[PDB]
Design a protein around this ligand. Structure first.
Ligand SMILES: [Zn+2]
Ligand SMILES: [Zn+2]
Lengths: 76, 597, 188
DNA sequence: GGGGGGGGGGGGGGGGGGGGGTTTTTGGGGGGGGGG
DNA sequence: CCCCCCCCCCACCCCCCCCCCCCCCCCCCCCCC
């Protein structure tokens, strides 16, 4: 039981981490960030927390890509 | 050389917005608000130098609670934040998210800068919300137009109904069918960002992730229908209504029948032609997405409780506009106090009736006790103007009548003589058992009514005849009439020594501006909260000898039970915790007056 | 001359479709104002360059793949998301006009017509107004070849100082008697 | 020993086919009210 | 107080989708420099 408590604390660390990666208000609240780059051009993302954290905005703009490189395969 | 975080479509910098809000959320002082508003000379340093929002955040953090109320005029009172007000009105969701994040950062930074030890993990785990309110003029629901479609607005109106709480998904939870690996996906703009392939590179199976519905994380949504208040309608057409969406701890902020304000972003969304298609109708549903909602002592208590004239003082104070009927006033005061309950049922209700001529003060008396009592009702003995006396099955639903709705309060019934016979029968089990029996549609229950009744009744015809008994003048039958503790007659019989002084008292109300009329409700409240009289042993013998006296003079045990309840009510008055001989004596005396009718 | 003439609703035969006509009637009911789209605006997540869809119809289909060459020339299948803030809405309101009791022929039901009013002209019509409304009489497809039809409103003609002007009656005198007689003056 | 070319597998896109898309009258029971 | 009445409530084109086929791209293996 003590070790179970240790396990629960270990995953609670993940809870306090994913919380910061979660919107403080409902999903439809939907404020729009615009990232202006170092050049005179602009990107746009809906991340409500990302408005105050360009780290989140950058990795979300990366995760937004529909593309993935194709990946490869590989009894008695 | 670096990227900029911009509120889209505005060129407002989010760093600037953040710091403009921070330097108000800390270091604002309430004295500045009186500079903005009228009566600026009422500034006072010993009450207004307070760091108002530091004070709010401190009490809030000691309560550990997530929400801050923010009157938006306080932004306009402060120089670095007057622009933030316009950004708040025009671009609300971004600014509000920034304000939320800033409140959380203030809570984090305070426990390391003001540096008292606290659970940093608790603040880290918690979400924080600002609730801006008093954003601007309460523009009409009928006045809204498509320029509002993203602005923070203010509305006033009437709540018709609300849905039950609707689960709204905030994080989808996915599990791999082959390898049982799990990943959490935040819902973005209402869309599930489904992983096409399993995350684990050592598995990476396509289309193998599946949604585990009851392991997702859900926010609370509720929809409430708000009707245009009849104050604002044009006279020749129906009121409008607006659906409003409300979330988390703002769910069930209001109930059906509440008149409210709301502050919220006006929103609109498309709706589908048919669910099997993406095709959308060319004009959007509109709703308001709310961020704030609002509706529409002991030292003096013990000091007044020391008075000797208290019985007469309180009795005259229930209706000082009405000319002298003082034993009626005393009886109704004792009805407001009431007796006590017991477990074993016998209960603290006291029940009163007024009869005699129709064109007299009894209606005003019922109105005044209705205004005084915390949770009573006003009604009359028959019919229903969408409000009726008995509980009733209708569409299928059970509706609770005025008697049942008056649970824990005085039920004021006028036209009590003209009451319908089914109602006359129904009154017996609330008089005796303080309940009404329901046995329909698969539901069986004694629906507890727990109400003291103040009745107002009339003779047959225009005039009461005092040379005939009450049963001969009044329509309603004796066995019901017997259940009342006190029964009174008020008559219009001419006498100038009464009528002239009544007329002068009445007419003087148009000229003039001890009578604790507003303190009466507080005294009643604290008495009902704190005081539970028990009968003294000597008071047993007093009750017995008094009862046998009036029995030697046609009494029944209902009179003795009434004298007990009146004496207990008399002991709640004066805040006395044990019924005295004088309490029994006054209960006896007032009942002796009443039973002689 | 046809825009001048005040037709009754039943006199609006099918030959008048597309024409600017003026109709005389009473407004029997009015909708609350709703936002119709003129131009939908989409943010693009994966390039930032917004794109637009003009809507000419009762219904539309939402865009998904980013058609802009900033995506398409890079063959990047970026995602479009609708934005209300950048979309042009127009104020829309539907009303129904009905022909007056004098216009109804003997033994017929009073016929009625939908009015669509857009822009600044919105909420110029209230129920119970007796009014001439100029508009483009138009069809809408839903029946087969039978058409729904409405009037795109263009112009409205309604059929129907004191704190010192009150001193006219004050100085005129005998105010109680004369004002009392003026309630229903023809009634003896 | 490394780079190019050839050959085979695997994935993605495009095309084609298919299926889905409320008041008014009549009768009955029960409740409430009025007249002798 | 009893009975009868009467009142109330109730019952063919277009989009989404799925399957099939073809080509292209990427990796691996073998040969040549
Ligand atoms: Zn897997
Ligand atoms: Zn794009």
């Amino acid at each position: 039981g003590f070790e179970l408590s240790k396990l629960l604390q270990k995953e609670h660390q993940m809870r306090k981490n994913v919380i910061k990666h979660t919107s403080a208000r409902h999903s439809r609240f939907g404020g729009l960030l615009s990232i202006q780059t170092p050049d005179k051009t602009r990107l746009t993302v809906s991340g409500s927390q990302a408005l105050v954290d360009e780290k989140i905005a950058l990795q979300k703009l990366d995760d937004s890509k529909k593309w993935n490189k194709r990946i490869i395969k590989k009894e008695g | 050389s670096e990227p900029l975080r911009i509120i889209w479509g505005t060129n407002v910098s989010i760093q600037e917005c953040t710091t403009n809000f921070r330097n108000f959320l800390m270091s604002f002082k309430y004295k500045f608000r009186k500079i903005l508003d009228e009566r600026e000379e009422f500034i006072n340093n010993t009450t207004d130098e307070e760091l108002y929002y530091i004070k709010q955040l401190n009490e809030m953090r000691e309560l550990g609670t997530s929400n801050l109320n923010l009157d938006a005029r306080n932004l306009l009172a402060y120089k670095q934040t007057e622009d933030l007000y316009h950004q708040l009105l025009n671009y609300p969701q971004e600014v509000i998210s920034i304000m939320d994040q800033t409140i959380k950062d203030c809570m984090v930074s305070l426990i390391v800068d003001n540096n008292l030890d606290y659970d940093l993990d608790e603040i880290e785990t918690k979400f924080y919300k600002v609730r801006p309110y008093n954003v601007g003029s309460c523009k009409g629901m009928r006045e809204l137009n498509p320029n509002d479609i993203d602005k923070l607005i203010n509305l006033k109106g009437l709540v018709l109904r609300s849905t039950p709480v609707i689960p709204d998904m905030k994080v989808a939870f996915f599990k791999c069918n082959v390898c049982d690996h799990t990943m959490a996906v935040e819902i973005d703009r209402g869309v599930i960002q489904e992983p096409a392939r399993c995350e684990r590179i050592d598995c990476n199976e396509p289309n193998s992730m599946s949604l585990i519905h009851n392991r997702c994380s859900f926010a609370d949504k509720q929809v409430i229908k708000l009707q245009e208040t009849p104050d604002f309608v044009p006279d020749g057409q129906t009121p409008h209504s607006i659906s409003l969406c409300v979330y988390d701890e703002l769910v069930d902020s209001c109930r059906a029948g509440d008149r409210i304000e709301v502050t919220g972003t006006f929103r609109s969304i498309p709706i589908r032609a048919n669910s099997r298609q993406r095709v959308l109708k060319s004009l959007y549903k509109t709703y308001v997405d709310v961020v704030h909602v609002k509706k529409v002592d002991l030292a003096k208590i013990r000091e007044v409780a020391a008075r000797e004239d208290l019985y007469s003082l309180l009795a005259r104070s229930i209706a000082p506009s009405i000319y002298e009927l003082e034993d009626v006033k005393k009886g109704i005061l004792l009805q407001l106090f009431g007796g006590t309950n017991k477990t074993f049922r016998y209960r603290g209700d006291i029940n009163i009736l007024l009869c005699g001529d129709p064109s007299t003060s009894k209606s005003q008396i019922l109105q005044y006790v209705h205004k005084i009592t915390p949770r009573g009702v006003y009604t009359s003995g028959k019919g229903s103007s969408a409000v009726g006396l008995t509980a009733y099955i209708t569409r299928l639903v059970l509706e609770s009548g005025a008697l049942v709705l008056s649970d824990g309060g005085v039920c004021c019934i006028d036209e009590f003589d003209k009451m319908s016979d089914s109602t006359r029968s129904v009154l017996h089990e609330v008089m005796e058992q303080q309940t009404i029996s329901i046995a329909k549609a698969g539901i069986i229950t004694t629906l507890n009514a727990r109400s003291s009744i103040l009745a107002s009744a009339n003779p047959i015809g225009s005039r009461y005849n005092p040379n005939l008994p009450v049963t001969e003048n009044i329509d309603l039958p004796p066995p019901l009439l017997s259940r009342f503790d006190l029964v009174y007659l008020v008559l219009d019989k001419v006498d100038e020594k009464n009528d002239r002084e009544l007329a002068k008292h009445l007419t003087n109300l148009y000229l003039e501006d001890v009578l604790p009329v507003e303190f009466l409700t507080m005294y009643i409240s604290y008495a009902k909260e704190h005081i539970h009289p028990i009968i003294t042993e000597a008071a047993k013998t007093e009750l017995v000898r008094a009862y046998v006296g009036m029995r030697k003079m046609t009494a029944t045990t209902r009179q003795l039970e009434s004298m007990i309840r009146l004496a207990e009510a008399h002991a709640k008055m004066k805040l006395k915790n044990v019924v005295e001989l004088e309490d029994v004596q006054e209960a006896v005396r007032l009942i002796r007056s009443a039973i002689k009718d | 001359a046809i825009s001048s003439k005040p037709l009754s609703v039943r006199q609006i035969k099918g030959d008048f479709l597309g024409q600017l006509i003026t109709v005389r009637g009473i407004i029997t009911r009015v909708s609350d104002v709703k936002p119709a789209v003129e131009v939908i605006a989409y943010t693009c997540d994966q390039c930032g360059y917004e794109v637009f869809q003009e809507v000419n119809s009762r219904t539309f289909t939402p865009l998904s793949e980013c058609t802009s060459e900033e995506c398409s020339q890079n063959q990047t299948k970026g995602q479009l998301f609708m934005s209300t803030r950048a979309s042009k809405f127009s104020a829309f309101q539907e009303c129904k006009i009905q022909e007056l009791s004098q216009q109804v022929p003997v033994g017929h039901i009073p016929r009625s017509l939908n009015i669509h009013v857009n822009g600044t002209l919105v909420r110029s019509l209230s129920p119970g107004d007796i009014v001439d409304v100029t508009g483009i009489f138009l069809p809408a497809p839903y029946a087969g070849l039978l058409t729904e039809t409405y009037l795109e409103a263009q112009f409205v003609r309604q059929h129907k100082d004191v704190e010192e002007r009150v001193m006219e009656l004050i100085t005129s005198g005998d105010v109680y008697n004369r004002l009392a007689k003026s309630i229903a003056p023809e009634i003896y």
